[PDB]
Each structure stands twice: as C-alpha cells, then as structure tokens.
Design an enzyme around this catalytic site. Sequence first.
Site, short mmCIF file in Angstrom:
data_model
loop_
_atom_site.label_atom_id
_atom_site.label_comp_id
_atom_site.label_asym_id
_atom_site.label_seq_id
_atom_site.Cartn_x
_atom_site.Cartn_y
_atom_site.Cartn_z
CG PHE A 282 -0.60 8.90 3.41
CD1 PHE A 282 -0.30 9.61 4.82
CD2 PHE A 282 -1.56 8.14 3.40
CE1 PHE A 282 -0.70 8.88 5.77
CE2 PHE A 282 -2.21 7.80 4.45
CZ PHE A 282 -1.72 8.03 5.88
CG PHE B 277 3.07 4.19 8.02
CD1 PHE B 277 2.54 3.75 9.11
CD2 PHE B 277 2.90 5.68 8.10
CE1 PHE B 277 1.84 4.36 10.21
CE2 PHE B 277 2.32 6.28 9.10
CZ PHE B 277 1.96 5.81 10.14
NE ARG C 190 -3.42 2.30 2.82
CZ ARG C 190 -3.73 3.04 3.79
NH1 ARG C 190 -3.11 2.72 5.07
NH2 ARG C 190 -4.35 4.19 4.00
CG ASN D 299 -3.08 1.30 14.48
OD1 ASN D 299 -4.36 1.64 14.02
ND2 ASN D 299 -2.50 2.31 15.17
CG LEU E 176 -1.54 9.42 10.78
CD1 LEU E 176 -0.46 8.57 9.82
CD2 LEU E 176 -2.89 8.57 10.94
CG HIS F 73 -0.86 5.19 13.28
ND1 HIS F 73 -1.03 3.88 12.52
CD2 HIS F 73 -1.99 5.85 13.19
CE1 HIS F 73 -2.19 3.73 11.92
NE2 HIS F 73 -2.84 4.94 12.28
CD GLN G 4 -0.03 0.06 5.80
OE1 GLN G 4 -0.59 1.09 5.63
NE2 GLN G 4 -0.66 -1.07 6.24
N1 LIG Z 1 -1.20 -5.04 12.71
C1 LIG Z 1 -2.17 -5.10 11.91
C2 LIG Z 1 -1.88 -3.48 11.05
C3 LIG Z 1 -2.84 -3.28 10.10
C4 LIG Z 1 -3.66 -4.06 9.82
C5 LIG Z 1 -4.13 -5.23 10.37
C6 LIG Z 1 -5.31 -5.98 10.21
C7 LIG Z 1 -6.22 -5.85 9.16
N2 LIG Z 1 -7.03 -6.73 9.35
C8 LIG Z 1 -6.57 -7.61 10.32
O1 LIG Z 1 -5.51 -7.22 10.73
C9 LIG Z 1 -3.19 -5.68 11.45
#
Ligand SMILES: Nc1cccc(-c2cnco2)c1
Length: 164
Positions: A59, A112, A54, A101, A121, A125, A62
Amino acid sequence: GNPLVYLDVDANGKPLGRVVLELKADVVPKTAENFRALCTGEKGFGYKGSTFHRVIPSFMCQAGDFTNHNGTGGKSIYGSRFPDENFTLKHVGPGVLSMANAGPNTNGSQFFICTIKTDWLDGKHVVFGHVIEGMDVVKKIESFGSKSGRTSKKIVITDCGQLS
Ligand SMILES: Nc1cccc(-c2cnco2)c1
C-alpha cells in the site's frame, strides 16, 4: 525547475540510504512549497528527526507527523492545515508522493509514498511528486510495516533537505 528534495532514513539506528523526491511545483506550487520548506527546516520546524509511523505493505509508507509522531499531528508552513490545491496528478503507481489527510482540506505535514497504484485515493489526496531515486529504500521501509500500519523497526528521517 521543480524542487528536488531528499530524506535520509534510518531503521533501528542504521542507515537505509536516501530517498530523492521531485516536487511538482508546476502543478501544485503551494503543496510543493510546504514540503520543500519542511525538508530544509527553514521555518524553524520540519521533518528532520521525525518518523515513518504508519507503514502498510503493498500500500504505502506514511510519515511527516513531526509534532505527535503517531498520525494525529503535524503542521504546514502556512498554519495547522491548508486546502486541497487540486487533484490533477493521480496515484498512478509505486513511487507516488501524496498528502495524507483527515478529510477534505486538512493537509498539514503528513505525507505518504505509495508502493502500489492507489487509484481509489484519486480526488481525495493531493499528489505532489514522486520518487526520483531510492525506491530500494522505500521497499526496505515497506518491509518493516504490517497490516495494521504498526512498524516493526523504528524508521527515522535522520536528515532531509533540498538538492535543487
Ligand atoms: N494533516 C493531517 C493528516 C492526517 C491526519 C491528521 C489528523 C488526525 N487527527 C488530527 O489530525 C492531520
């Protein structure tokens, strides 16, 4: 001192170069340690071979979903998820390294690198480091992103590890 770690990044099988990151273990030791160990692969798993899945221009870039490669996966060295350690470091500008997250206390392995100040953020974050060297590589990665996050090249962390 604080760990220095690296990510070597390919785009469509051609090397872009190296991103070197300082992990702020002095501020967020648990978060730093997780990232460090995932770079070395010393727990039997980690970032080597995974992708930037991503990427959104102006921005962030990720990565770190080494289980599902799409933003739904990843795991920490402690278990599937671990708490937000603190929000002491802020998203001050380009080069900030921060945990992705899915809400409070859902840190895993996804992370990211910011390409702008992402102040909204802050408090959401966990910032845990920054780019020491290789912002040029980050800007290349950024250039292969899109508004949706979908990448236009396959961006792979071919190698990673600890420098000090
Ligand atoms: N740790 C982390 C970070 C971003 C998304 C996720 C995520 C999304 N769906 C299940 O886990 C988990």
